[PDB]
Amino acid sequence: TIKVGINGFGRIGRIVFRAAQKRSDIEIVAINDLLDADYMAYMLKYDSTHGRFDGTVEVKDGHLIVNGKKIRVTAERDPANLKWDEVGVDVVAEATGLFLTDETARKHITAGAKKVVMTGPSKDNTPMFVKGANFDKYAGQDIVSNASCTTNCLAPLAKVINDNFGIIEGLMTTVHATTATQKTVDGPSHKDWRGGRGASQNIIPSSTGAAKAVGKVLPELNGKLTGMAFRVPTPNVSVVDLTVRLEKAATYEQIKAAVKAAAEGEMKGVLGYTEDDVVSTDFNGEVCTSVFDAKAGIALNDNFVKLVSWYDNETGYSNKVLDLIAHISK
Amino acid sequence: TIKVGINGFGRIGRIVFRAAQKRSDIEIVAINDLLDADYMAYMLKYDSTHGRFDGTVEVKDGHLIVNGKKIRVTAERDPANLKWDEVGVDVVAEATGLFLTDETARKHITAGAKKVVMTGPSKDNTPMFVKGANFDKYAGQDIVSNASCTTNCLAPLAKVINDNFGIIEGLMTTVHATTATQKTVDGPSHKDWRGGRGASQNIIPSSTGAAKAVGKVLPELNGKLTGMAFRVPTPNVSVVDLTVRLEKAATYEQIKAAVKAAAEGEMKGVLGYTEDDVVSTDFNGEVCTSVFDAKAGIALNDNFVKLVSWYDNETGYSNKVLDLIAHISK
Ligand SMILES: *[C@@H](O)[C@H](O)COP(=O)(O)O
Ligand SMILES: *[C@@H](O)[C@H](O)COP(=O)(O)O
What we know:
homodimer; about 25% strand; oxidoreductase; gapdh
């Protein structure tokens, strides 16, 4: 079993942990964040979006004890001092979002850890990997990125489409749920003015970390597609609205069959396919990082079409993070 | 002064009323709906979305008295006998969403009125007009349709883009604010299953008139444009996301200037232009039916671009309905 230390107990860190309990090839042994087991335990037992924790939580002498296993609670401001080797961690889930560079991220290895998987897109040229898109392209690296929730949604869908009909070009839009980096009411957001406005009252045009981030994970589509985001007042689960020009002509029924096929074989678990009259809440807790909404998309003609695909920016992403850990760990 | 009577005191009927108060060419003289002057006055005095009515509203003698002028309230489940001529109404603002056909709408002329403006996409062949797109094409028709709010936002923008660069093909998406037609919690919606789900908890894939309803008002784009909608948890103000491929290459600066020009010239008051860091609430009360969002849009290449335009689905459309009344009136 793989030992993993989580740096950052924010939204991602807490769900990465939850999703993990259900596994076997992985085990969280340490959690580091500027919070005490006491409070840290509380943010685990209660969740406004996903419900109460499924197991047991106890704080025994400065440390966590979930479902029996004892977790090591720390609070280091500087990674280097994490003394990860002590608790003996194989790979680190870097989820504080502060160390997205190799320079900074390496401080984990130095601290006794073998490899580090950033739970967000890298700020430098550190490799990025998205399950179902380029996982099989992993080259032993000891520091990697799992991109962003949107790229994880857009990448797989864009792949099967390109692979089957060839994408001449395409533009996207993701109707994004509210994240923690937004404000409850009109407040300060210097580098992002729009994103400072009341999150619950507005539709806020944003930018997305999946624009051409997909152009990196899937080089074949580099420079062939960008996008944006429209942050709306929901707590979780977003959706990508992809408009593409196809090389080989294809009927909508043809596109449906192509993704459904992928969702059932090659990309099973990553890509999903549905024909039901679904809405955002129906994907709360969804493990697939991209669930095709057959009935939603529209084709103008055989070479111009709009495809829709859901994703739980929390549950899907976090699950594939553990998947990336288990991969580089292979 | 044109004498107008409103049939249906819903969201539209009420905002149309408020807007008209500012005018000098039009006057509301009667209002029909299954509500009394009491309840009817109350819904005019207070509005969760637009604030308290600015002016005097008193219900003396079973009839409204707004800012002095006495309005005649009624309640006729059947328009056939509204006795419109007693009050001397020229044009009827058909805003019940009930009689969207010639026959049904005709009952308004049969009842004493001269012309009738349907405040919604017509179900039969009644011609639809959208200010800024084809108001010029009016041929005296006694019964007309002002299309829907999303068409009023899309039509103008599409025209200036088509006109200047020529739209080969295009697909849209409108992130729509909640409407009275939706349910507060998961409920019954026989014809629209997705639309019955909790309005405030979901991003709900939908369908939209504007789609090819634009192919009608704007004949040249017939079959070249279609789209959808995503109903989000906001009270008012939506936004169209138009992805089009141009015949004539155009840099984004060129598209900015063409739109800004239209807004400052031939389409002043219909098409609006902005370069600020705006969000939805910034357009609550907005009178233009299509405000271009410069910074939000994005160009992939000189022939494939995504354009963004805002609109107050209530205020904008309502104002133009009156603009249409005055048109066929002249
Ligand atoms: C998921 O990683 C975040 O909540 C949203 O970021 P994107 O760049 O839009 O995917
Ligand atoms: C404005 O007429 C309505 O609130 C929305 O209808 P659409 O068909 O989306 O324009």
